[PDB]
Structures are given as structure tokens and as C-alpha cells.
Symmetry: C3
Subunit: 416 residues, 3 copies
């Protein structure tokens, strides 16, 4: 592929030189034709960039974005002197989209755990900032949002590199966890200040996603560092608590709540999977599971306060049920006893019951939630079946399931 990108660079640079020449000559027809070439080059680059995004070669994607930056610069240089607002609109929107895509790449680079790609991407984002700055210097809010995003990314990167070097240097876990907490606290404070600054929904969405990625990166490097599970658990709980606080600030929209749950659940699941891989005693696993479910429930409750969509409620509840199913599957893969599984299953059902009691407001949603509860009970009983649990355990869980179903039906009879 690289030849095509290099050709597009050659083309776009030629378009720049031809445009500077055409500006010296006053040739509006050449300017029009190179503007067409520049748009078509940008189209070729965009089409290739989506292909690179599909295949996951970040270097090519970033290079394609740099071509898009260069093409935007040429288009903007033309649009500036021509006064053509449709070119200015196109370039500005393309630059916004590039900023979005490079931010997504930056999040992905953090998620994959190589910081050099993120740094390069962030450099390209500063080029995007230069293009944006020449495009619209009066949108101080966009600039400041990009700066906030950048500042957060830099803060995350500073913690990331510091931690990565402490790991490579073989530092004592006590120093590491003090640094990690200081990182989380600083990130939280920065995010909290950013939440005072900004009002773009997408900026907040991005911000929380970055924070979540920063917590996940900490989790990854800390876990690869091989620290004793007690430290992993303590950092995890602090991270979940921070994530809950920062969500309680930043989340106030359909997508933000849905994504916040998706993130917190993902990070919970990841952390529990790390505890499973290190071979932690099930007591710690169960504490993380409960504390995670409690946090999730508190978030679900918080998010629900604004709500008017049964559809969002349905998907949220579905995600909560998927979370419970995943949690039980992790304990089962972890070789947990049926008595640990029933304790967890009971708490999970009780959380589901409480979350249904918060969320539910129609018979239709009541049925859907009930069906989810029932499906969880089915999977839970299927775990007890797979471990060959005594019939009393099966009866206990089944009765609890029936009782929860009955109580939710009593609430359903109040709603209907």
C-alpha cells in the first residue's frame, strides 16, 4: 500500500507548488483545477484511510491523516484567497473529522499500549490544530477543547511513561501504587476541571473515554508488573471509585450513560480476568465482583435520574445482565465452588432486582426486565448444573429466582 500514500504526498505537494505558482501567475483556472485535484486527492486519501482503519494499521492511518492535513492546508490556502465558503466548510468539517479519527486512534494506541504511535498522532493533532487555527481562530472553545483533550492525553502519557519506566526499573510495588494513585487523582482533578470548562457532548464523551483508557492502561501495566493481587484489587477499587465520580460528573446523555456503563463493566471484567490469570484466592475475586456490581448499580441509578427512553433502559439492563453472565462465567472458569457461585448469583439477582425497581416504569419494560432476570437465573442454574451442585443449591437459587420474579411482578402490578 505505502506507494499510494507516497504518491498522494507527491501529488499534494505538487498541488501546493502548482497553487503557489498559480497564485504568482493569477491563473484562476489552474487554481480551480488544482482545487479539484486537491479534493480528489483528499477523497483518495479518505477512502484509503477507512480501509486502513478496517485493517488496523495505525501507521498508515496516521500517514493518511497527515496527507489529509496537507490536503486540507492546500484547500484552505485556496479557499482563503478565493473566499469560497463551501471549500472552507468542507475543510473545517474534514478537519473536525480528522480530529475525531486521530483522537480515536489515540485512544486505540493507548488501548494497544504503544505510546509512540499516540505521541506521533498527538503531533499530527497539533498539525490539525495549526490547520484549524488558520481555518477559524475565533472558535476559542474548539481550540480549548482540543487543548483540554491534549492536556488530558499528555497527563495520561506522563503517568504512562513514568509507570512504564518504574516497571522496567523494577521499582517496589509500594512506590508504584503511590504513583498510580497520584496519577488517578491528578487525572480525576484534571477531568473535573475539564468538566467545568466544556459543554460539547462529544468532547465530554471523548474525555470520559480517555479517562477510562487511562485507568485501563494503568491496570494493564500494573498487572504485567506482577504485583501481589491485594495491590491490584486496591488500585482497582480506587479506579472504579474515581471512574464512578468522573462518570457522575461527565455522564448526562443517552450515549454517555450507555458508554459509561460499557466502560466501567469492561474495566471491571478486565480486572477480574487479571485476578483470574494471577490465580488470586476466590474471596478477593468475589469482593471485586460485588464491589463492581454495587458501583454499576449506583451508576445505573445515577444515570436513570434524567431518563425518558425505555429503549435506553432496556439496553442498559441488557448490558447489566450481560455483565452478570460474564461475571458468573469468569467465576466458573476460575473453578469457584457452587457455594461461592450461589452467593454471587444471589447478589447479582438482588442487584438486577434493585436496578429493575429503579428503572422500570411500564409493563412492556417490566416483561423485558423480567425476561432478563429469568435468563440470568437460567444461566446461573446452568453453572450450578455444570459444577454438579447439590439439588438444595439448585432449589435455593430457583426459589430466590421465583421470589425476585414475584416481587418484580408485584411492582409490575403497581405499574400496570
Amino acid at each position: 500500500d505505502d506507494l499510494l500514500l507516497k504518491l498522494l504526498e507527491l501529488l499534494v505537494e505538487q498541488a501546493r507548488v502548482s497553487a503557489e505558482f498559480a497564485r504568482r501567475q493569477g491563473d484562476e483556472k489552474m487554481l480551480e483545477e488544482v482545487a479539484r485535484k486537491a479534493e480528489e486527492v483528499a477523497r483518495k486519501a479518505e477512502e484509503i484511510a477507512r480501509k486502513a482503519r478496517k485493517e488496523g494499521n495505525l501507521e498508515l492511518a496516521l500517514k493518511a491523516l497527515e496527507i489529509l492535513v496537507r490536503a486540507a492546508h492546500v484547500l484552505a490556502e485556496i479557499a482563503r484567497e478565493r473566499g469560497n465558503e463551501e471549500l472552507q466548510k468542507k475543510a473545517h468539517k474534514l478537519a473536525k473529522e480528522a480530529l475525531r479519527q486521530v483522537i480515536e486512534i489515540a485512544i486505540r494506541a493507548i488501548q494497544e499500549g504503544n505510546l509512540e504511535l499516540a505521541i506521533i498522532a498527538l503531533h499530527i493533532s497539533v498539525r490539525i490544530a495549526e490547520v484549524l487555527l488558520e481555518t477559524r481562530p475565533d472558535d476559542r472553545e474548539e481550540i480549548r477543547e482540543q487543548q483540554a483533550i491534549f492536556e488530558l492525553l499528555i497527563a495520561a502519557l506522563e503517568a504512562a511513561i513514568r509507570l512504564e519506566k518504574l516497571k522496567e526499573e523494577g521499582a517496589p510495588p509500594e512506590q508504584i501504587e503511590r504513583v498510580a494513585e497520584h496519577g488517578l487523582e491528578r487525572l480525576k482533578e484534571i477531568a473535573k476541571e475539564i468538566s467545568k470548562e466544556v459543554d460539547s457532548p462529544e468532547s465530554k464523551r471523548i474525555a470520559y473515554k480517555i479517562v477510562a483508557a487511562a485507568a485501563e492502561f494503568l491496570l494493564k501495566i500494573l498487572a504485567e508488573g506482577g504485583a501481589t493481587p491485594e495491590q491490584l484489587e486496591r488500585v482497582t477499587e480506587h479506579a472504579l471509585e474515581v471512574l464512578k465520580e468522573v462518570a457522575k460528573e461527565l455522564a448526562d446523555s443517552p450515549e454517555s450513560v450507555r458508554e459509561a456503563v460499557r466502560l466501567i463493566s469492561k474495566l471491571t471484567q478486565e480486572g477480574l480476568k487479571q485476578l483470574k490469570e494471577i490465580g488470586a484466592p476466590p474471596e478477593q475475586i468475589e469482593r471485586v465482583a460485588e464491589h463492581g456490581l454495587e458501583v454499576l448499580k449506583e451508576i445505573a441509578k445515577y444515570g436513570s435520574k434524567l431518563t425518558d427512553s425505555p429503549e435506553l433502559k432496556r439496553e442498559l439492563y441488557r448490558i447489566i445482565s450481560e455483565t452478570a453472565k460474564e461475571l458468573l462465567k469468569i467465576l466458573a472458569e476460575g473453578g469457584a465452588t457452587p457455594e461461592q457461585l450461589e452467593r454471587v448469583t444471589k447478589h447479582a439477582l438482588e442487584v438486577l432486582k434493585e436496578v429493575a425497581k429503579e428503572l422500570a416504569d411500564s409493563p412492556e419494560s417490566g416483561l423485558a426486565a423480567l425476561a432478563a432476570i429469568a435468563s440470568l437465573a437460567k444461566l446461573g442454574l446452568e453453572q450450578l448444573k455444570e459444577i454438579g451442585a447439590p439439588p438444595e443449591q439448585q432449589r435455593r437459587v430457583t426459589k430466590a429466582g421465583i421470589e425476585a420474579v414475584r416481587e418484580i411482578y408485584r411492582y409490575g402490578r403497581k405499574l400496570y
Copy 2:
């Protein structure tokens, strides 16, 4: 070697920085001294560049050209603000020589087929264009000729990179052939429009060389791709036809014809070489040989109608005869039956006779043509002897030789 080039770079940059300083001081003596230093640095670079050209390291030559470009930039920048026309004339001429050399390198990069070298060369050609643009705001025509050349190189690269990828992807040879034709026909019509747009004989020479190289590359990549001989033959005809059409526009000077036939001969030689290498039946080879020879004949005629020089006529005859002799020698090395050898020998004698009938205007040119015909007969008889052909075939050939020589004398009898 590169350390010397690197010192020359930093010397150039120090000349730039010291020239900023000297302008800020008003130190005309320092400007004179650093201008001498920059000329001498350029002289070192020019000698090293010609050394690199002799050794065939394109990277060194290109880097040395970039040094020459940077050196020219500072020289021209000083000369412009000084009003020094001798330095301005030196810089423009040197930059034009650099443009020639980079174009030749770009053609060589197409010939060697590593398109990354062609990309790097093309990038340096953009740098040449930038310095030229800062040199000549007035000669927009020369700049536009360079742009046309660049656009042709770009078109060639679009075909080249498309084809390279299309064969990396292992596509149907027929789909490849449709793309290759679309490349050639687009290139040809572009070249025709370029032939209207430009007027420098050398620019047209360059353009034709590029077109020839584009066909040559397509042929080489297609043949290395293992496409069946029918595709090679079809493309070869189309390529010859293209070369013929563009030559019929461009054949306005002695060396233009000489080059045109040389390039047609090259394409023909590569054609037979690939048909030999793939193991095609001599049936295809002999058809292509006839095609190439008759195109050559019609071009040789056409160029002769546009021209008068005795030495050109002599050279054209010589080249045509050497071409025919080499093509017959290739067919004989290709192991074809004696029948194909005599068929081609007869056709070649007829071509040479027609060429004599077009060219000949002095007893000396008659004798030279006769001597060439005799040399062709000698080589033909030598190949019939080496394959051990029946004596009747040998006699048939020498009789045809005498008959041709008789007809040459019957023409010459009008002049003598």
C-alpha cells in the same frame, strides 16, 4: 562517501545562516566570501554527483542533487538581493542541468523498476521546481513544460503503482491487460496534448523517452507477472502503435528520429526477449518481428520525409540494419526453424531495400546501403550455416541477396 555530502549540507546551511547574519550586519565582504564558498561547495557537490552518476548509486546522486538545489537556493537568494546577474544565470543553468539529471534519474528509476527511488527522485524534482519557481517568476512556459513532464511522470506512476498492486493482488491477466491498455491510451492522448502544450525539442525528447519507459515498464512487469504470450503480443502491438503515433507527432529533428528508432528497437528487443524467456512458439515471435520491422520501416520513412542530413541517413540505415541483424540473431538464438529465419531475412532485406529507396541520394549512400544489405545477407547465411539448413535454402537466400543488390544497383544507376 556520505560524510562529505553531509559536510557540504552543513556548510550550505552555515552559508545560509552566515548570509542572514551578514545581511543583518551589512557585511558585503562576508557575502562575497560566503558566495565564493557556496559556489565552491556546489563545485565539490557537482563533481561528487557526476562520480555517483558514473558508479550508478541513485541515492547518492539524488542526495548530491538536493545539496546542489540547497546550494543553488542560497546562491540565488544572495544573488537576487545583490542584483548579481552572473550568479543568477549560473544558478538557473545549473538548476536546469539538475532538472535534466533528475529527469534522467527518474527515467532510470522507472527502468530499474524500484518505484520508491522514482518517488524520492520525484520529490527532489519538486524541490527543483520550488527553487526554479523562486528563480523564474517570468518563464511560466518552462515551468509549465516541467509541470507537463511531471504530470506525465505522475500518470506513468499511477499506471505503475496500480499495476504493481494489481499483480501483488494476483488479479486476472485480462483485467490487468484492460488496465494496461487504459494506462497506455491515457498516456498517449496526454502525450499528444503535451506535444501541443510544449515546444522545447529536448522537452519532447524527454516526453517520448518517458512514454517509451512507461511501455517498457508495463511490458516488464506484465512479463514478470507470468501473463500468457497472447497478452504480451496484444500489449506489444498496442505499445508499438502508441510509440508510432507519438513518434509521428514528435519526429521533427535528426536526433529525435535517431532516438525514436532506438527506442522502438529497444521495445522490440525487449518484446522478443520476453517471448524467448516465456518460451512462446516462434509463430508469435515472427509475427511480432514483422510488426516491429514494418513499424520501424514506416517510421524510418516518415522521419526521412522530415529530414535531409547525410550523416543522419547513414546512422539511420546503420541502426536499422543493426536492429534487423540483432532481431534475426535473437530469433536464431531462440532456436526457430530455418523457414522462419529465411522468411524474416527476406522481409528484412525488403525493409532495408525500401529504406534504401527512401534514403539513397548519392553513390556513397548507395554503397553504404549495399554494404549493410550484404552484411545482413552475411549474418543470415551465417545463421543458416550454424543451424545446418539444406543447401537449397542457403542458395535461395544468397539469390535473394543478389536480387536485392541488383535492385540497389538499378536504383543507383539513376544517380551514377
Copy 3:
């Protein structure tokens, strides 16, 4: 590692782009905040640069310096529009310190033989020159000193790369020596002209260090080139002689003598190491030893005119004695006869006596000179003991030592 500095690059770029935005907006508060941030970035960079200097990774050191120069550039670019003096004062001082450090690294890179590091250092020096030039274009003497240093480095590097090439080519050592001699003579004439231009003690100190390093490099490359010991000795004499000339021209301050002596001693040591490793006859070693000591005494004699510092005189005598001790150590490691040991030891005592006669001016300085020659006598006797020289040789040397002490006491009786 590098990523830390890359974050600093991002912060620098961000500081620039935000400061250009803040200049479009009139945001004095942002300018103040980013200026503080840029100073803190420079603080981070300075500490990292000290760490790199300690670890001796020159690639990192040069990277860190370049990024420091970038940080200085943005700091100055902000301070210029602000009209702030203290930032300009800081930047100018820091840039001079960076120039000093990069020059030291350039000397070290000449020592470590990979001239690409010296080229990168030289590139950074040109970047420093741009920063200095945009900082204070009226401080022309500093710029001209940097130019003199650059010119000297260029002269050295041109000889260096020429020798590297002739050595790699396998040129006859006589031609290499002719080139090296011409290099040294050219370097001396340059150093003379530099000494006619400059008056900064540090500039002369740097200059002489560079000259000494150039001779040292020439010696090392010629020795690696396998030249016969006679050529090494002839070059060594020319080197000592030219080092003496340039030292005498440049030196008018205390540490300059101490360093000059140290450098001459180093070049003497390196020469003796070559003759020892190649297995030269001790006759050549004894010539080099005498010639070095003779020159050292000429320099010590010259230097004695410049100051009354007792500490300096004691240091010079100390270094002279260390030189004699090292010379004996090398001669003994060379397996030379007790006759060579007495020949050299006698000269060593005598040149020490001359050095005492020139330098000493007090009872305390007499006792120091005495103490040193007595220490030399102790080592000399220890060498004659370790080689197992016959008691008569031990006694002959011991009496000569006592007589040197007697002569020193004859002077001591006039000093007290």
C-alpha cells in the same frame, strides 16, 4: 527513554501553537501560563540532559540538547513579542552553555571516531547559531567566535574524513602523512588567524582543545592505518611542534597552561602507546620521550612567566612528574633494557631539575619540587629493582638522584 523528551517536543509545539493563538486573541494570561510551562519544560529537559551526560549516551545527549535548543527557541520567540528581559537573559546564557556542551560532545565524538555524531552535533551547533542569531544579532563577536569554532571544526573534519577515506582506500602512508601534515599546518594557520580575531579565554581554550583533538585523531587513524613507526614518530614530532607553537600563541591565563600541558602529555602518552603496541625499537620510544619532555619544559618555561599561583606551579610540577612516571611505566612495559631505563631516567631527573630551576621561588615550592623528584627517584629505583638491574646500575642512578637533590638543595639554600 526518548518519549519523555518527545512529550517535551509536543509541549513545545503546543506552547508555540497556543502562543500564536493567544497572540491572535490577546490572551496575556495564556501567554503567562504557557511561558511558565515552557520554562518548566526546559527545566525537565535540562535535568534529563544532565542525566544523559552522566550516562554518556551521546545520541540521547544530542537529542536532549536539540530539544533544549527547541525549548529555548520557543521561550525566546515568546519573550521577543512580550519584551521580557529575564527570559532573553536565561535563553542567551542557556544557549551559550548548550554551545559549550555540544562542542565538548563534538570533541568527544572526534575521540570516539564515529564522525556522524560530530556531524549531528555540528547540525545542532548550526541550530544554536540560528537561535543565537534571532536572540541577539548585535552580539556579533559571539557569532564570529562560533563561526571560528565551526570553521576550525570544519577544517578538522575535512582532514578527518579525507584521512578516513584514504585509509579505507588503502593509500600509501607517505601520501596520508603529507595530507595530515598539510592538515596540521592549515589548522595552525587557521588557529593563528583565530588567535588574531578572538580575546575570550574560553574560546581559545576550546580552540586549542579542538586542535589537540585533531592531532590526536590524525595520530589514531594513521596508527590504525598500520603506518610504519618512523612515520608515526615524524607525525608525532610535527604534532608536538605545532601544539607547542599554537599553545605559545594562545596561552596568557592560568588554567590554559595546565590544560595545554595536560593535552601535550596526552598526545605524548598516545604516541608512546602506539610505539609500544606496534613493537617499535626502544630507540624511537626514547626519542619521543625526550622530544615530548623537551617541549613540555619549553611550555612550562613559557607558562612560568604568566602567573605567581603556587597551586598552579605545584600542579604543573605534579603533572610533569606524573608524565615522567607514566613514561617510565610504558618504557618498562615495553621490555626495554636497564641502559634505556638509566638513559631516560637521567633525562627525567635533568628535565625535572630544569623545571625546578625555572618554577621554584620559595622554601615550600622547593620542598614540593624535591618531594616530587624524590618520588620519581623512588619509582625509578622500583623499576630498576623490578627488572632486576645489577646493583651498580641501581647505585649509579641513585647517586645521580642524590646529586639532583643536591643541586635542588643548592637552589633551596638560596630560596630559604
